[PDB]
Design a protein that fits this description.
Chains A, B: Residues 248-254, 272-276 are annotated as: RNA binding. Chains A, B: It catalyses: 7-aminomethyl-7-carbaguanine + guanosine(34) in tRNA = 7-aminomethyl-7-carbaguanosine(34) in tRNA + guanine. Chains A, B: Homodimer. Within each dimer, one monomer is responsible for RNA recognition and catalysis, while the other monomer binds to the replacement base PreQ1. Chains A, B: Its EC number is 2.4.2.29. Chains A, B: The active site is at residues 92, 267. Two copies of one chain form a homodimer. Chain A is an alpha/beta fold. Chain A has one domain (1-370): Queuine tRNA-ribosyltransferase-like (TIM Barrel, Alpha-Beta Barrel). The first copy, chain A, is built from 16 helices and 16 strands. Chain A has an eight-stranded parallel β-sheet. In chain A, α6 (124-134) packs across α7 (152-174) and α12 (270-276) packs antiparallel against α15. The longest helix of chain A is centred in the C-terminal third of the chain and has 27 residues, at 327-353. Chain A binds chain B through residues 38-40, 42-45, 67-68, 72, 75-77, 82-84, 295-296, 298, 312-314, 316-317, 320-321, 323-324, 326-328, 330-331, and chain B through 38-40, 42-45, 67-68, 72, 75-77, 82-84, 295-296, 298, 312-314, 316-317, 320-321, 323-324, 326-328, 330-331. The structure holds the ligand N#Cc1ccc(CCNc2nc3cc4nc(N)[nH]c(=O)c4cc3[nH]2)cc1 (2 copies) and zinc ion (2 copies). One zinc ion is lined by residues 301-302, 305, 307, 309-310, 336, 339 of chain A. Residues 301-302, 305, 307, 309-310, 336, 339 of chain B line the site of one zinc ion.
Chain lengths: 370, 370
């Protein structure tokens, strides 16, 4: 396999389905990436993550640089060997998590200094270096996720800094031969909810040139209607022949609508985190397994789901486990939710391939929201 | 397979190896039973428990009657179907856990009333009924685990009550046709550390007649030297042709010494509980994976262990997981510890079969305590 090759096999409107080939494996698109922040997808062995259908997982520069440390992971042979996942890994660059999680931050043109949630530093150069030490397959540019809401002036100033940082990220990545030859680099579009700024950002990223393009600065409290409005004009600004990655999204309906708008890749902690909290995804909408109505329900979590959890255990048993705070409850809920998300992605890919995605989207929504 | 058949295939001194055949499966002896108190062996799928080599697991009358409830489990098809373990299950009778865990208790000749850790009741009749509702394969008599230390007079009075309760347990079990035809009933010897009381208890249980005999009232703070001293005279008092079950034991060295003294079956929360707390068993003694010395150690938990955890992940990774409070850390530590215990039991069985168990015991101790 090549370092990186994205091929589009079928289209319907703005939606695309195809594959990304990389040295460590093939990624089917549209793709959902389970999140493995601290070098583990919470409550799942990597073999289980793979069994659900995942082609690629996400790790985080911010969390891993703090614990166990990037240099340490490199000394131990890299993130893949460390956690036992041999397929592609995309790492976020730290630009979002530092501002989300750190107690104290100092921002400047150089980067961000911060206190661990110990004093630490991130910059385009250090972020790309950390992602190299981790051995990430898809490296994200170091950016600034503009808070929402933002005034046009603040959004512009923020976006402009991110574009300068995108160039620095590109140069740092290219300066490291082993990284440039074996990994891919994605740029991140900013500009808040403003069409002109989104266009300027897209133009700047395309001029620099990346292997893929993320839509950053969304899923930050704006709500679905607004997110979709921004995607409507923002995605067509990106190069058509490269993957489009919507960061931090989202609920099943968010994913369907984003694919309708040209998005190829997604990550979100929702299925894992909410699974541990008792929320199970089903084709008839989410349920909370803690609810007393499930205490004697012998049906599986979802009536059609093909996952190992739905083949073997009842709602009643999983209800008991989650109520009792049992680890197996977190394990079973998480495996089902991740499997559900992968089944959603498979149905999306298949329907686009067959030219019936618009109908799938309509049927999906009618049933999910009934 | 029959309801119950215990066959001894080989002996060495007081040690025996053989099999218990039951309707739901064969149990190789000496046997270790992983503990699954709340209808789950904590942090393991039942398929994983089986993969480690376990032939039988333990459940608890006390915990299950409180949550999710015995009648509820019966309505849902029984404990086996509920948790997804189709092999034999032994259930403790509640006699020990009620006094260990309940906030308030009222003891009488009838049984024990107690407050949930809601007011509840246990008696020989209700305990046997609960174990029936659960669908237990090996049912334990309802007894009283005498506190340690005990005066001879208090130990005698306690033991005498337990023997009356053993007869009531026998009669309750026999009165229920489906239970009597499909399950087995074990009696529990009491008498504290006193040879004469242990003899009286053994005589009383043998007169009633049971499918197996447990040594109760130990692992209650007496320490290994004293436990071994009591086993020295207590085990030979039990019928030779039935299994001997030491309740709540124990560390690897406790198990080896107890087998040398004629014990065939064991249960203990140590490998699961201490696994979650970071203690890993190895042939060179226990280690605490939290220790900083393991942060960059690429070796598996144990150098010889054949488990899936030792095949794939390093000490360094598991150290990181346990330090971070990650669920996968609990999962991996638990699977390894249970697998280690099963490998210990296999080495014990094999060495007895080959007439080299005494040598195995010596070699085991020299290395484990080096
Ligand atoms: N449970 C749950 C749950 C918790 C949080 C979220 C929102 C995630 N939103 C989000 N992640 C992002 C990551 C990002 N990373 C970078 N480097 N840049 C972004 O603009 C960016 C934007 C994001 N927006 C969604 C679901
Ligand atoms: N980690 C850990 C850990 C926690 C506790 C223990 C001690 C367990 N000892 C023990 N369990 C028992 C259960 C028992 N059940 C019944 N029905 N009767 C007993 O005499 C009896 C005696 C026991 N002794 C051992 C390890
Ligand atoms: Zn499922
Ligand atoms: Zn192991």
């Amino acid at each position: 396999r090549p370092r990186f090759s994205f091929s589009i096999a079928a289209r319907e409107g703005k939606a695309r389905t195809g594959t990304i080939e990389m040295k460590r494996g093939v990624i089917r698109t549209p793709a959902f990436m389970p999140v493995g922040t601290a070098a583990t997808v919470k409550a799942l062995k990597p073999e289980t993550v793979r069994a659900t259908g995942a082609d690629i997982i996400l790790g985080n520069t911010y969390h891993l640089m703090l614990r166990p440390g990037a240099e340490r992971i490199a000394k131990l042979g890299g993130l893949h060997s460390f956690m036992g996942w041999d397929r592609p890994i995309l790492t976020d660059s730290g630009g979002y998590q530092v501002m989300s999680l750190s107690s104290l931050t100092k921002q400047s043109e150089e980067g961000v200094t911060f206190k661990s949630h110990s004093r630490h530093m991130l910059s385009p150069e250090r972020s790309i270096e950390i992602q190299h030490l981790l051995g990430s397959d898809i490296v994200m540019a170091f950016d600034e996720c503009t808070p929402y809401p933002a005034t046009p002036s603040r959004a512009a100033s923020s976006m402009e800094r991110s574009m300068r940082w995108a160039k620095r990220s590109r140069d740092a990545f290219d300066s490291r031969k082993e990284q440039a030859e074996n990994a891919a680099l994605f740029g991140i579009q900013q500009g808040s909810v403003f069409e002109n700024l989104r266009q300027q950002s897209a133009d700047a990223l395309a001029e620099i040139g990346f292997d893929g393009y993320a839509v950053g600065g969304l899923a930050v409290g704006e709500g679905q209607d607004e997110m979709f409005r921004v995607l409507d004009f923002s995605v067509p600004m990106l190069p058509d022949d490269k993957p489009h990655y919507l960061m931090g999204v989202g609920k099943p309906d968010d994913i369907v609508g984003a694919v309708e708008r040209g998005i190829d890749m997604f990550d979100c902690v929702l299925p894992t985190r909410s699974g541990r909290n008792g929320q199970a995804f089903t084709w008839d909408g989410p349920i909370n397994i803690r609810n007393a109505r499930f205490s004697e329900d012998l049906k599986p979590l979802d009536s059609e789901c093909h996952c190992a959890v739905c083949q073997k255990w009842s709602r009643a048993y999983i209800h008991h486990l989650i109520r009792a705070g049992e680890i197996l409850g977190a394990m079973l809920m998480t495996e089902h939710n991740i499997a559900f998300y992968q089944q959603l992605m498979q149905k999306i890919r298949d329907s686009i391939s067959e030219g019936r995605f618009s109908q799938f989207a309509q049927d999906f929504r009618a049933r999910y929201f009934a």
